[PDB]
Design a protein around this ligand. Structure first.
Ligand SMILES: Nc1ncnc2c1ncn2[C@@H]1O[C@H](COP(=O)(O)O)[C@@H](O)[C@H]1O
Length: 292
């Protein structure tokens, strides 16, 4: 298929919940791209919404470039920079073990990506390893964030008036990485993206979280069981056997007020000081770079 005149559709490379991703070629440029397609007649149109958020994000480091948006035949179309494997994919490729160095290289960039989104007046609300992708080629050392399907404005662009506190929210995103405040049904804010990152980092450290693979028939009972395990696992128990910085990070996130601006710089400096105490260099040599 020809798309937006200059793009050629190739084979599927990924299946989302709200769109499939296809390999493509920018025939004019001689460059591979990713093409996201959404059936025009989909019950729940989201691609046009996601594209608007990407436009507001554009020019960020580790934000995929949007090359073209249109409709074509029975599809809404978004053409974007082609990225590499997700951190979940690379975790599986690494036998579900990341070195401390890799976890800290990732933590540094992931805190910066979340800060960048927050600087653009959005919270992501689906912080999980599947939504962070390494670049390809020259961008291969760069962590990207994707899937702004669930993203939401947390403050007025103009006034910076924060969204109001709200309760009795149904659980938006993946329960495994959801904040305790999300489990309580509280409106998500900047703190919740960062608390989710904290669970992602301990997930990379452990290979799994203690509230993973809990048995339930129905879904709300599964979320209640995840909530109960999360709220009965002290941060010092979750983080036992790992550097204290992972616990300090999570304690900091749990202490944030609904409308607080997180101290992103403090959280990066926490991991940077540990990184330096270990004698690591920021040379972007990740575990997966050493697979032969
Ligand atoms: N720009 C991209 N480059 C490569 N793979 C992508 C890209 N965007 C999404 N994917 C993949 O497509 C799936 C999810 O698409 P999405 O609905 O955009 O989150 C996952 O398998 C992602 O790894």
């Amino acid at each position: 298929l020809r798309v937006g005149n200059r793009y050629r559709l190739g084979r599927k490379i990924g299946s989302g919940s709200f769109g499939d991703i296809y390999l493509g070629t920018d025939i004019a440029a001689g460059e591979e791209v990713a093409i996201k397609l959404e059936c025009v007649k989909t019950k729940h149109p989201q691609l046009h919404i996601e594209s608007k958020i990407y436009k507001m994000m554009q020019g960020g480091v580790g934000i995929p470039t949007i090359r073209w948006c249109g409709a074509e035949g029975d599809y809404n179309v978004m053409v974007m920079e082609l990225l590499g494997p997700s951190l979940e994919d690379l975790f599986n490729f690494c036998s579900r073990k990341f070195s401390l160095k890799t976890v800290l290289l990732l933590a540094d960039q992931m805190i910066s990506r979340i800060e960048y989104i927050h600087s653009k007046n959005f919270i992501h609300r689906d912080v999980k390893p599947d939504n962070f992708l390494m670049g390809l080629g020259k961008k291969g050392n760069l962590v990207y964030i994707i899937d702004f399907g669930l993203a939401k404005k947390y403050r007025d662009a103009r006034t910076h008036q924060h969204i109001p506190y709200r309760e009795n929210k149904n659980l938006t995103g993946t329960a495994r990485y959801a904040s305790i405040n999300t489990h309580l049904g509280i409106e998500q804010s900047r703190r919740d993206d960062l608390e989710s990152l904290g669970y992602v980092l301990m997930y990379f450290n452990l290979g799994s979280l203690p509230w993973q693979g809990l048995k339930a028939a129905t879904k709300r009972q599964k979320y209640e069981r995840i909530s109960e395990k999360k709220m009965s696992t002290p941060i010092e128990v979750l983080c036992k056997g790992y550097p204290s910085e992972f616990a300090t990070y999570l304690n900091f996130c749990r202490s944030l007020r609904f409308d607080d601006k997180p101290d992103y710089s403090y959280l990066r400096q926490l991991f940077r000081n540990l990184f330096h105490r270990q004698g690591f260099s920021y040379d972007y040599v990740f575990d997966w770079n050493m697979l032969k």
